[PDB]
Design a protein around this ligand. Sequence first.
Ligand SMILES: [Mg+2]
Ligand SMILES: [Mg+2]
Ligand SMILES: [Mg+2]
Ligand SMILES: [Mg+2]
Ligand SMILES: [Mg+2]
Ligand SMILES: [Mg+2]
Ligand SMILES: [Mg+2]
Ligand SMILES: [Mg+2]
Lengths: 282, 282, 282, 282, 282, 282
Amino acid sequence: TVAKAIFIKCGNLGTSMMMDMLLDERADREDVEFRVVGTSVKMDPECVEAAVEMALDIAEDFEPDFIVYGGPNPAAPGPSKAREMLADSEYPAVIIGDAPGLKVKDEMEEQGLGYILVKPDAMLGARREFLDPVEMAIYNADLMKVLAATGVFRVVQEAFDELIEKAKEDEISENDLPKLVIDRNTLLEREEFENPYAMVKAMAALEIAENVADVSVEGCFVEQDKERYVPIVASAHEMMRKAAELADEARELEKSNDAVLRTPHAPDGKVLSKRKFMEDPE
Amino acid sequence: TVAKAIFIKCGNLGTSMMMDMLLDERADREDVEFRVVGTSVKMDPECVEAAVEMALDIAEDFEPDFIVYGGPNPAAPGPSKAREMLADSEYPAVIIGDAPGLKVKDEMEEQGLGYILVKPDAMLGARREFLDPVEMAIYNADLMKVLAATGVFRVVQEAFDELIEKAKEDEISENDLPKLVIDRNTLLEREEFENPYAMVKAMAALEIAENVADVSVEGCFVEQDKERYVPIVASAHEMMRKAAELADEARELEKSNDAVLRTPHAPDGKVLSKRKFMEDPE
Amino acid sequence: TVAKAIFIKCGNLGTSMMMDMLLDERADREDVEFRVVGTSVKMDPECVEAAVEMALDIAEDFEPDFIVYGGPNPAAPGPSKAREMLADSEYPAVIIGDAPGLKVKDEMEEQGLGYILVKPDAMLGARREFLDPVEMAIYNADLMKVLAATGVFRVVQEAFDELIEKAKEDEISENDLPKLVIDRNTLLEREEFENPYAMVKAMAALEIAENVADVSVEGCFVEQDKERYVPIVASAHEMMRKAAELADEARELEKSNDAVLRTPHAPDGKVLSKRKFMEDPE
Amino acid sequence: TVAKAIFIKCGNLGTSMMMDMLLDERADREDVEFRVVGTSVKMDPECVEAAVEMALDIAEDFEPDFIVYGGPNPAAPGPSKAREMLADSEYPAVIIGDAPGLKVKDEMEEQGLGYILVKPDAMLGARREFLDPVEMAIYNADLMKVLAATGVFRVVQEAFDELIEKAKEDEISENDLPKLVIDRNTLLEREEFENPYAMVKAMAALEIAENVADVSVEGCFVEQDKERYVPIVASAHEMMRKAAELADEARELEKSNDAVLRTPHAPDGKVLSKRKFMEDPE
Amino acid sequence: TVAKAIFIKCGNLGTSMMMDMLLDERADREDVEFRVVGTSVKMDPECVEAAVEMALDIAEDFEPDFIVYGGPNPAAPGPSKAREMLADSEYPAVIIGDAPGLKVKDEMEEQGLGYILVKPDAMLGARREFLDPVEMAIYNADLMKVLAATGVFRVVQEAFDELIEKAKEDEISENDLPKLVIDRNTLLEREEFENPYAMVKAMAALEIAENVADVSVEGCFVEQDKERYVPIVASAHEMMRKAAELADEARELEKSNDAVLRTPHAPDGKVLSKRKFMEDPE
Amino acid sequence: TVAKAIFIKCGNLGTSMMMDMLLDERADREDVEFRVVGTSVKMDPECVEAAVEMALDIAEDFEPDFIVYGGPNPAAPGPSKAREMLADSEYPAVIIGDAPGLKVKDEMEEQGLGYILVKPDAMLGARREFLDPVEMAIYNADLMKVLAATGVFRVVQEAFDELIEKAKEDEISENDLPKLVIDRNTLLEREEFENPYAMVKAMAALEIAENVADVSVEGCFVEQDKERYVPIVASAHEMMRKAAELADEARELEKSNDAVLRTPHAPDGKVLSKRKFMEDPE
Ligand SMILES: [Mg+2]
Ligand SMILES: [Mg+2]
Ligand SMILES: [Mg+2]
Ligand SMILES: [Mg+2]
Ligand SMILES: [Mg+2]
Ligand SMILES: [Mg+2]
Ligand SMILES: [Mg+2]
Ligand SMILES: [Mg+2]
């Protein structure tokens, strides 16, 4: 049995960039089929409605088991429109967002929607005087390293792998949909790191990443004097570059102990596991 | 006038991940509208045909000025199917690929297709014993840093910004479509770096990135003994992590000279430019 | 001529550690004379009363133009007892503290006391399972580097030096007592850095340092499960270590531009200035 | 029993900055009480006399079990005056100093004084053209990191904790006073590091720190041409920065082995011990 | 007992620099005696003939069991003249060279010569506008670190040591002459590293080092525009510097596991072995 | 005119490894011809005599303008034998050695010999339990980097190039022979570095390198307990590794200012100069 899902991407978040690929890392899974659609970085109501309409049009013939909408701020006008539309459909749906989505957690539960809110997936320093295409890619590279090496992406992988198993049995109820809020403390109960200083460095990285959002918000929405907001948004990006270095340090500590956790998918979808470098995943 | 384009993403390449977002980094461009569709990491003929069918179905009402297909190896069976389908349509199209696409350069020109082949966008170490979702994200983070900080993404941004200006006048001929092959030497004629050692470090990074592909190919397709191919594909990822460090070093050298090039888009689409940190882009 | 002051130290703050020495770095100023007294790390009301008693006791013959009380949380029982005793004395006083001091900011202005509150001077992870003497010294070394290389200590040096001048004019009124709150944004109003990225890295260092406090507070006072609070306080120390590294990176950028600001004292007390390494300070 | 001591600080040494704090890192010991006095950085005969007078006057009602004088060069005029005054007093006393103190080791033994001479606690590059307040704080941050992470501060902690136990017998014989000389080779007799390379990197850091003193002395007291002495004193600071980086590397090695030694004090003064991060100190 | 050999050095290779010293690291072996002769960096046929003449001249009385010729490109005119003269002599010979030596591999086996071709021993960026004496020494330092820390020099040490044993048995036949080609994959057949990531980082270092050669060749012999060839040769040197850093990182991983392999010679010549730092070599 | 010289190498010193190569970095000088002979690492009286005999025998027909003997400790038995033999010969000669050579500086002057004594060229940690071939190569790679990047090799290059010009007069007076002692302070009289912090970091690297010798001597010739001497010699190597990192940092600072001094030789032997990367050497 093959699980099917549609992913909708409007605006950009580190987790939404990677969400679907974390589920079939080598494209050799025989038990899933996905469609991805979106309006690139635009996330205003008009564009989001168009993205969701594309998804629901495709859904008629594709018959997805679930639909995922990912992008910044579930509480903003565009994303709110996607929530209304998905909540109004027959398809089980999950919203992937950032910390600002906490504001509409109750609304989503009432809408029968699942959610994964990633607090360290911080908004970048989006002022024209600082953020050009290259800087936007450098920041996303640092954020991707943080979310991957700290183990945050493994939490997302697990949540979706569980939903995929239920999708195969056409047994996805509203109570099966995730209601997750990820942050620094999430790491305390993961079996991610064998070395404790790796866990602690990873936690420091996620704390710094979560803190970057407040700096970006101050420089993009509060401060209006350019002589002040340009340095402010740039400082947010310097923070994120150091958070990636902490995440890199944590991973190198696991390498020193030959204890790097790897959880690849088998062709039939089963999530395997290994720690030692030369050990086969099982 | 608003330029419209559809991006199709099958399989994953660092350049295809970012291609559309490099054109509207803060989502405030009033002169473009994009639709993005794809089948995630799957790039076999069946999936690619489905992705292209989605795009062409959307194209009827969306009326794009051009269509872009991005993903690994334009010469593989799946991508070749996309090339046939796009070549058979009325829509000007561009193929974004990696070095293996060089094999079908002549075919694409005969098909009336543009192309941007990025040699340093290297295939990862895709063996199940090593590549799990987290490792696949860490590698992509390093590759994204390399492609961004060396200036490769600025070359892509420029090529598409030129096509967008022509799209606005509905004047995109086959001769206007790009025919670009990017590698280490491309950097020699860019006005990217003010400091020469930054350029030289960026070139070293792209050379190492291009070389990673041969290692990944050896470990994934040639070597069949796991005691040998697992270390081989892992060594490819260690190379890419050092290429990202070189790219980071180049950018820090530009920072030391307060000469970091930034080329953000104005709301009307115009590509602005600046070097000094406190200088407004113009 | 020759101003005099008494410094009282109870508990420890990075700023209180260095405050007096920042005013006579080579012990060759002839316009100042200082006395330092305290009860070491203890800062309970009994111990703080004893410390101010010592200060007030020696003030009788020493005759200080002003007295300084420095240590953590001026809102706590111990430090509050000290503000009480100093406000009702015949010597103008200044309170050096950290962010919690903001709770009693107005109360201090009402008491006729001066103050310098350093937000980035963060409480450390004071849990017995983690913080031994060596770890405390390591954390203080990192904090000392942050406060010094970001330029925060220069702001403090300048405040006390201006007061030392007002004091020589035997006219120290309340309107002369400093009323400073120092944080990341303090750097925007300074000319500390010639290189813009050095200032932005220094800002990021101060933001991380300020954020360390919330983590230490959670681990010391809120979280009660030791499997969680030990990793939490350690993650605060890993954050500070990276803040120290950003501060170091900033200073190295100034070195690359041969623009390290140095403001040494002359024997008469005047603050000289220089930027180039081989430039005499004027 | 509650042991009591008075610490006198004139001039600045890394060990004198931290000595008292190393004995009650979280201020929760109920078996000790300290008073700290001094004249800040000034250490001339006049100031040191005043410093010891304050101490002796306080000693009257405080009734300490021992007195500690810490500062650079026990052989200089001021410190020599302090040695005579303390040697003459009724209180058992210990002198904390640097390598120049070796010149009067026999003399202190005849004066009935204890001593802890720390060779790596090197004099800084005190030339006006180079050493301003910020540079002095940066140097001290590096030196503190070296003395902490190499284990030197634990040697000092242990010596005083041993004396405090003796004091609880209200009988400190001259025989009980420490007579220690600490340097690179001190580590060979300790079990500070579980990893041998961490021990040898720590030894290299202490050797470099010890060697800094000779460079500082040359630039401050021998070389008279500013074109030569400013570079000489700055080179001493670059050496101390790298010593701190070596000490940091040693500690990260202990982290990789989850073997960081921690020896916190219990509320009753007992020194506990632990190696594994998640293990309770016992 | 006491084997003898003559080493001839013309031109420079990292391996030829170190080959003889790797056999008697502390100059205390009593089973070997060596003579070294050459014409420095010159390797033209006239200079190489003179060097072999010296060797053959001293061989008359010295009576070497074997002669070694080491330097770049055994396929070039100069080195070919040396293979000619050595193959037609009464002393068994071995040729140490780099990758270009593969062109004449069969030709050398036909000449009855032994060989050790080190692929990672890459030609440097020998253009006058870039390579001065200091840059050449820097490049050689990085290459020397790569060849040593990755374990390549141990492979070479072992080849010559086994030959030295065959030589003492006065039975050195052609079947005893080494026929080695060393590259990244050579490490897969060794037990050099206890930590798997140290071996993978060492493999990546050797792959980058091998790739440096193609870049140097392009800049020195193909590219003719100086605005392009100077950056090209410099990028090859930046690559080697990162290869040296990966090799260093690998060695540090072995240190973290206290597993640095050491194979020192005993006075009698037997190769001892040890892994733990404090373990006597047996 | 074609100057000729013979280099004799017994034992190993960093300066003796590179001395001849520093004079013809690309082997294109047509004004010089060299012969190099030696006994590898052995430097006992027997071997050194044989070494000088080879040289003197070759000198007959070669007819060099001067002879150079390079190796550790000019004062040891073997080197002393070489000094006597060369002093007695008809050829002007120069002795290259390390700091122990200072012991016979007056003697060499009376022997009519020139000398270049390099204090930072430190003896390595030659204890069997620690120094195997790989460790020796690693140490030498770090030392080479220090002597190259700090500018010491340029001092040596210049001294010999000055002597070669004299030799082209077929008249080298004793007065023409170099009498140099190189150490940290040598940099103060050079204009090697455009950036002053690069100069002081290079000075710090040479100081650390010079200080390594004393640690090595202690572990090799003074300390007899293996539990103490193995850590001692390994600590000397950790110091040299950090000295190399400092020298690397100095060079990267020159790169940031596009001010890397390069002084390549022209085909006729003239020494050219350039600072800016893209500028031709003149
Ligand atoms: Mg439903
Ligand atoms: Mg409902
Ligand atoms: Mg169910
Ligand atoms: Mg067409
Ligand atoms: Mg056509
Ligand atoms: Mg046209
Ligand atoms: Mg439990
Ligand atoms: Mg031109």
